[PDB]
Ligand binder design. Structure first.
Ligand SMILES: [Zn+2]
Lengths: 140, 1074, 98
């Protein structure tokens, strides 16, 4: 037999015994549909936060927003999505505009590379120009 | 029906499929209940048509993968085909003939080539490959895939990337050979050369043409040849099976110990993988113990089975690996609410759907029965039915360590407030009853300071400094360093100037709820991901008592009810004397006291619930969660041990480097701030009722069963070991190329490389991570929170800080990891045999050698090889300046000492010099190397080579082959080094003048298997025979079967053991308790 | 460096980086130069996953302009304040109201 691969790789007198019945006479108090749906929703894994990490060629996967502003942006996005989860336009649980002053919290973004510099230009471009500086040709 | 698990089956003949799970003979989990005919099964997520089945969302690495084929990674290919007349052509049996099959190719030249899994029937294949092209063909594409983002050439490899590329190639070689040897049927033989030996038959209709390949002894000695006399030198009684298992399944044996074609490196890797995988197996009795313990006594389970040993099912990992996975999960957050909001939300939904508490403000409406009463009713808003804040309050207790729940500003008095306003008084009441249910380090400070703010202008308290004032907002007291000394020491509050504030401070210091803890899960068999906490408990910010729903709702032993009563008494004392309220034109004290008494004596059972049942549900869900709780100790008023910072470090404790604080330390609080609704919490607290016919045993035994029938803790445990494996392999493979203090063996130091930087190490780590995920079939996170800045690290570790500066550093230990030490072993093997992979040791010499002699460039005579110790040689460094000679004087270059030597003699060049002056040197040296006397030795260390076989009886010239390489040499990359090797022969050939320009320094032709094997002997050309030492267990008589010399030379015929296991699904009979 | 064209600036700003093919008045100077003073050699990575606070690099410059900008930065760094003192100042001006 074989098992399909999920992700891409580099290939790209017997008698009915007494006491047996299929009838049901009991219904669950907690329930079996509601609890099963709640557990199904809770079983999902945690989102892979891939921003700020290198890609195969070296460029940093991400967006160019400032770190603090971009963290505040995702906080506001989570606040928005909580309302959609709770069915109401407004939200009671808020991950934004809480009383605590967090002007120092930071989230990973594509603005910064791995060495402390800035990804204004992606690394591949940077190495390309650095190598294109020293080159030579055949004499005329 | 089945008489084992009492599961009724639709068809009687279906019993054979069902009993296999129990282990008898003829999907993921199977759960059956003992009081209802509602079975539940779990299937893989990626399958389609999941009718009447439940999904397993969590990722599952594929650990058990079989291989019903010979396990070797070095195949032998012909290079120069040849055919010769032979004496004996075929065997004869009566009126029949059989063709003679040779175990090795009958070519003039043959050599060993690395090809991973070139003959293996595999069910699930790791989609990795290490496929060497034949050396006559260009093979540089596998020294280029990593970190050659841009290259000035296309068919060139960057010489500075060689160590990283070779390490990644070795990692792929290890990862693509992680399979278990499936046991297949045999077949007796009666060939007059292999008499009575039970051979092995591969699956498929072609199970009869593999015999010559696997068993060299099968072919006899028909004529005189190298292969024939090697077979004659071999032994007879070591073929086929050697030892078979005692216990049997049906007629087939369990495991067999068989002689066949294989290689030492792969058989050792697979043996180590088998040992590691079998070291983690578990017992169904252990699983039923685990589930019974996790059920907290409300449910008992049982997992019947039949005695057996072939069962394998790895679900045992270490607390160290659990802690490493927990640390990785914590670092995945990176200070954002998008990854933690769904977890809290759906745990809130689960708690709402499991908890028996039903919340309804009709109790409050009936108690009021309706001015303070109307004002408090309008402020409480009984018409709103959203208590997500209340449920998230309980949900955040588990995840205190990453998120801290606080009270939103709008819940406080609007404008600082005053005790002259009924609305502000009610807001303070709501705040007082809502604050204690928050996982905030300083709740009491806010609670006291709110009343202090409201009571400005009626009574004062001493202040520590002139910067601050009593009339400062209570929302700013979010940090332990802002606790007033008057609140710390009650004696400073003068009773004459603060009779109410002193009473409130005393009440807070006396009746604030005390933290506690509860035992959850099972540490013995499931381990524990608990950090800063013993592995068996789960702390709470409230006290807990044994569960029994018969206690009075009005009960001041319960601390929450006592707190509500004391708050009501404080409000009554505040309002009774009518001072602090000038402007109230009526005697509203008679109504205020009445409504406060009603609130104090309300019928709510939420205080009973939160201390008698809520810990039970929390302890039930806690082991079943995808994200195990990350928690921090709770303290009431001991400010000297209040946590203030949580961080993760990458470096070892015995090093000093740049302080790179993790992003988790940038929050003012312990973690991400979360806001709740004090109004919602108070409304949920002041109401709530159990069903009249509630039975705890029935309710919990009915609610637990669907939860445990949809569990994934086994999958999470199976994934954590892979996570730790990846972490260890990453650190070991980055310390090889970077500069760290991790003690490694450092085998691959002769291969040139560079001092890796942060970006280079990050790219290498990302390639390793994606290769690992590709091999183990993952799609979600695995080892990529560690790629965000400076991946050059030594050890995972976590820590937290108190207010008084005393920290707590937790450093989990790490068991030796099988993939990493197998990579080290294969690197050791490569160090001794680099040639098979296409990499040559040493350095090349460029210079004309015009002679008719026949020797291989890979094994040159010592008469034309020179080094530094040779007299008269010159060594050139970075400073090499060319000067033209005027008026006929010879041009001359500058030596390392300062001398100017002409274009003659023997020279020594580093590769970097020609790399940086690829055009100047090429223009000036071609006319001298080709025609004049000039020998150049380019020190390289290691280089990929591709060689062309020329015909020795005709003229040859390698200048058109060498000038191409010397022109395609470029600063960024290196083309493959050409080599011209004459073809061996048997008949006396006629010699012709052949010229060579590139030769090697030391021996590199160890990949050559044999020359003209069909011929009786080799006369003209390089000489070689079948390597005796590689077939040690045959040629050597006094050698035990299990004798291998792995670090020096791999054997091509070994003792492979094969297994036939079974992995039954999780079966358990959930049983209720009376 | 930022900008549309960047290949030119590398050779100008790093003289030590070129090779020494022949005996020229420039190549002799390049050879006589010291080869371990190029680019960044010091950093202050005060926070992981964030911009390094400041670096020290070996690039072509003018000592006069470097000193002038150093004096300007010193003058500006003597004028610095933090939110901790901002909070105290704004709390004291408001007389405990805001
Ligand atoms: Zn059964």
């Amino acid at each position: 037999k074989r098992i399909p691969r999920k992700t891409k790789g580099k290939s790209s007198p017997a008698t009915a015994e007494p006491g047996t019945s299929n009838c049901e006479h009991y219904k669950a108090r907690p329930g079996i549909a509601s609890v099963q749906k709640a557990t199904e929703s809770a079983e999902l894994p945690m989102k892979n936060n891939d921003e700020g990490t290198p890609d195969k060629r070296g460029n940093t996967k991400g967006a160019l927003v400032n770190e603090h502003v971009e963290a505040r942006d995702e906080a506001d996005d989570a606040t928005k999505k909580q309302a959609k989860d709770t069915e109401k336009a407004k939200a009671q649980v808020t991950y934004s505009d809480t009383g605590i002053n967090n002007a120092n919290e930071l989230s990973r973004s594509g603005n910064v590379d791995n060495e402390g510099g800035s990804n204004q230009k992606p690394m591949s471009t940077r190495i390309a120009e650095a190598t294109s500086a020293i080159v030579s040709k055949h004499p005329a | 029906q089945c008489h084992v698990c009492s599961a009724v089956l639709f068809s009687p003949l279906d019993l054979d499929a069902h009993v296999a799970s129990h282990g008898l003979h003829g999907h993921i989990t199977e759960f059956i209940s003992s009081w209802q005919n509602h079975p539940i099964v779990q299937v893989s997520a990626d399958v389609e048509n999941r009718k009447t089945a439940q999904l397993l969302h969590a990722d599952t690495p594929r650990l058990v993968t079989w291989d019903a084929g010979l396990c070797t990674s070095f195949k032998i290919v012909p290079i120069v085909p040849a055919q010769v007349p032979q004496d004996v052509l075929a065997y004869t049996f009566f009126t029949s003939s059989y063709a003679i099959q040779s175990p090795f190719p009958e070519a003039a030249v043959s050599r060993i080539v690395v090809h991973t899994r070139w003959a293996s029937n595999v069910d699930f294949d790791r989609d990795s490959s290490v496929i060497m092209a034949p050396p006559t063909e260009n093979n540089i594409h596998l020294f280029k895939q990593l970190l050659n983002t841009e290259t000035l050439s296309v068919r060139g490899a960057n010489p500075l990337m060689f160590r990283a590329n070779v390490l990644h190639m070795l990692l792929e070689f290890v990862l693509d050979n992680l399979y278990l040897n499936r046991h297949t049927g045999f077949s007796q033989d009666h060939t007059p050369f292999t008499e009575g030996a039970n051979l092995r038959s591969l699956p498929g209709p072609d199970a009869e043409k593999w015999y010559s390949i696997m068993y060299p002894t099968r072919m006899g000695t028909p004529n005189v040849s190298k292969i024939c006399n090697f077979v004659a030198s071999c032994v007879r009684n070591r073929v086929g099976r050697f030892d078979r298992a005692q216990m049997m399944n049906g007629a087939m044996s369990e495991w067999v110990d068989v002689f066949e074609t294989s290689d030492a490196l792969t058989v050792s890797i697979r043996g180590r993988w088998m040992a590691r995988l079998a070291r983690m197996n578990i017992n169904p009795t252990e699983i039923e113990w685990a589930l019974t313990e996790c059920a907290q006594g409300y449910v008992t389970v049982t997992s019947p089975y039949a005695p057996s040993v072939n069962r394998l099912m790895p679900y045992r990992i270490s607390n160290a690996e659990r802690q490493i996975s927990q640390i990785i999960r914590v670092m995945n957050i990176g200070n954002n609410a998008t990854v933690i909001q769904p977890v809290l939300q759906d745990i809130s939904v689960l708690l709402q759907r499991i908890s028996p508490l039903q919340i309804d403000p009709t109790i409050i409406s009936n108690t009021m029965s309706t001015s303070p009463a109307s004002s408090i009713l309008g402020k409480l808003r009984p018409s709103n039915s959203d208590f997500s804040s209340f449920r998230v309050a309980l949900a955040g207790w588990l995840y205190n360590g990453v998120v801290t729940t606080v009270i939103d500003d709008s819940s406080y008095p609007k404008d600082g407030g005053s005790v002259t306003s009924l609305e502000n008084l009610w807001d303070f009441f709501i705040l007082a009853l809502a604050l204690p249910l928050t996982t905030d380090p300083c709740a009491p400070v806010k609670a006291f300071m709110t009343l202090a703010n409201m009571m400005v202008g009626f009574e004062t308290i001493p202040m520590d400094n002139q910067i601050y004032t009593q009339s400062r907002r209570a929302s700013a007291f979010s940090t332990p360093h802002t606790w007033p000394r008057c609140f710390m020491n009650i004696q400073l509050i003068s009773p004459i100037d603060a009779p109410i504030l002193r009473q409130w401070a005393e009440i807070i210091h006396r009746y604030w709820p005390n933290p506690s803890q509860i035992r959850y899960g099972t540490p013995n068999v499931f381990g524990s991901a608990n950090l800063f906490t013993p592995p068996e408990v789960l702390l709470l910010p409230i006290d807990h008592q044994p569960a029994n729903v018969t206690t009075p709702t009005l009960d001041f032993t319960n601390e929450l009810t006592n707190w509500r009563a004391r708050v009501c008494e404080l409000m009554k004392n505040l309002v009774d004397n009518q001072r602090y309220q000038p402007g109230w034109t009526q005697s509203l004290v008679s109504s205020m006291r009445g409504t406060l008494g009603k609130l104090k004596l309300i019928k709510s059972m939420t205080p009973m619930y939160l201390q008698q049942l809520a810990p039970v549900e929390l302890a039930v869900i806690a082991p079943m969660l995808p994200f195990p709780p990350f928690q921090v100790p709770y303290v009431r008023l001991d400010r000297d041990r209040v946590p203030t910072m949580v961080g993760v470090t990458r470096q070892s404790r015995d090093t000093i480097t740049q302080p790179a604080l993790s992003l988790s330390t940038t929050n003012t609080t312990v973690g991400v701030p979360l806001a709740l609704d004090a109004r919602a919490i108070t409304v949920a607290l002041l109401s709530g009722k159990y069903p009249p016919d509630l039975v705890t045993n029935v309710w919990y035994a009915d609610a637990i069963y669907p939860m445990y029938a949809d569990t994934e803790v086994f999958s999470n445990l199976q994934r954590d070991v892979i996570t730790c494996e990846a972490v260890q392999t990453l650190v070991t493979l980055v310390a090889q190329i970077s500069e760290t203090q991790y003690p490694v063996d450092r085998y691959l130091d002769w291969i040139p490389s560079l001092r890796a930087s942060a970006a280079t190490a990050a790219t290498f780590a990302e390639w390793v991570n994606t290769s690992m995920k590709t091999a183990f079939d993952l799609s979600d996170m695995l080892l990529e929170p560690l790629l965000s800045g400076d991946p050059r690290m030594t050890q995972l570790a976590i820590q937290y800080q108190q207010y008084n500066g005393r920290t707590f550093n937790v450093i989990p230990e790490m068991p030796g990891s099988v993939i990493a030490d197998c990579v080290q072993l294969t690197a050791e093997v490569f160090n001794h045999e680099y040639n098979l992979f296409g990499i040559a040791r040493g350095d090349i010499i460029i210079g004309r050698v015009q002679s008719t002699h026949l020797w291989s460039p890979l094994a040159p005579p010592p008469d034309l090889v020179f080094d530094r110790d040779t007299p008269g040689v010159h060594i050139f460094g970075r400073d090499c300046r060319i000067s033209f000679g005027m008026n006929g004087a010879a041009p001359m270059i500058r030596d390392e000492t300062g001398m100017m030597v002409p274009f003659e003699g023997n020279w020594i060049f580093p590769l970097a010099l020609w790399q940086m002056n690829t055009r100047y040197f090429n223009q000036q040296f071609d006319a001298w190397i080709k025609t004049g006397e000039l020998r150049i030795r380019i020190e390289m260390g290691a280089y990929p080579y591709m060689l062309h076989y020329y015909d020795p009886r005709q003229y040859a010239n390698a200048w058109n082959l060498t000038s191409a390489w010397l022109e395609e040499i470029t600063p960024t990359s290196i083309p493959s080094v050409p080599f011209m090797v004459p073809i061996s022969s048997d008949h006396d050939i006629s010699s012709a003048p052949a010229v060579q320009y590139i030769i090697s320094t030391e021996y590199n032709d160890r990949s050559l298997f044999c020359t003209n094997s069909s011929s009786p002997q080799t006369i003209a050309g390089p000489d070689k025979h079948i390597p005796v030492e590689r077939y040690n267990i045959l040629t050597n008589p006094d050698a035990p079967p299990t004798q291998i010399q792995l670090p020096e030379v791999v054997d091509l015929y070994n003792v492979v053991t094969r297994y036939a296991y079974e992995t039954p699904p999780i079966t358990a009979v959930v049983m209720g308790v009376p």
